[PDB]
């Protein structure tokens, strides 16, 4: 189709070389928002689990300033290998430096790229399979209860049904301590050019889902991209 493998996907969309492209603009909004959540709003703790990391690291760049350990996870093993190639500095890993430096810019140019990169590499110790449909999304791997579960652009796409979505939210809860943070970033797609129907139009329905899944909402913001910060009840 429009990309052949996870690396082709990365080369097509994450090179960050054109400031006015649709991809750069989306990526800047996601990134400003993650900097706000993890650096300004002080969402912080010891263990963060990243759900649907795919082959990308952009969603972890501000987070690694706030969490001691980050576990990266994905349903697709091929996504994880591409990710590992970068973490291990293996040959011909994707070049994340442009996105890395952008984030260093947002954070006030207190650090240059390599130091930031090294801090994320040190934070990441486990690279695991996740299946949001499973009562134990990480299967049989034991992991202490976490202080944060982060899901950027995964849940809406991973769950066709509202009932699937709700169960995933409860499945994710099983990975968290009481009081533990849930950070979702996702899109509420418009009806334009749409074939078939979608979970939401829309703020109210996403909130109800999160609340009824067992969380209290601390904040919800449109960026149709949205960010939501919740705490497990």
């Amino acid at each position: 189709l429009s990309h052949f493998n996870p690396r082709d996907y990365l080369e097509k969309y994450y090179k960050f070389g054109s400031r006015h492209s649709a991809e750069s603009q989306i990526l800047k909004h996601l990134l400003k928002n993650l900097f706000k959540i993890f650096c300004l709003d002080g969402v912080k703790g010891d263990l963060l689990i990243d759900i649907g990391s795919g082959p990308t690291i952009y969603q972890l760049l501000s987070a690694c300033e706030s969490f001691k350990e980050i576990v990266v996870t994905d349903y697709s093993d091929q996504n994880l290998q591409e990710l590992e190639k970068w973490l291990k500095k293996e040959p011909a890993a994707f070049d994340w430096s442009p996105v890395v430096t952008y984030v260093c810019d947002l954070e006030g140019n207190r650090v240059k790229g390599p130091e930031k990169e090294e801090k994320l590499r040190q934070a990441v110790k486990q690279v695991l399979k996740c299946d949001v449909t499973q009562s134990q999304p990480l299967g049989a791997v034991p992991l202490p209860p976490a202080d944060c579960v982060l899901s950027t652009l995964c849940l809406d796409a991973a769950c066709p049904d509202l009932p699937t979505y709700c169960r995933a939210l409860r499945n994710l809860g099983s990975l968290l301590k009481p009081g533990g943070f849930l950070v979702i970033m996702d899109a509420l797609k418009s009806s334009y050019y749409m074939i078939g129907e979608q979970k939401f139009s829309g703020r109210e329905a996403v909130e109800a889902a999160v609340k009824e899944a067992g969380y209290t909402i601390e904040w919800f913001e449109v960026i149709g991209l949205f960010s939501l910060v919740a705490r497990k009840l």
């Binding site: 429009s2 990309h3 996870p6 996907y9 097509k12 969309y13 991809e23 989306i26 990526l27 996601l30 649907g52 795919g54 082959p55 990308t56 994905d74 349903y75 697709s76 091929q78 996504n79 652009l153 995964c154 796409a157 991973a158 899109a187």
Partner: peptide, 9 residues
């Protein structure tokens, strides 16, 4: 797909 990730995109 962007900004969905494989294999959703």
């Amino acid at each position: 797909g962007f900004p969905y990730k494989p294999x959703f995109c």
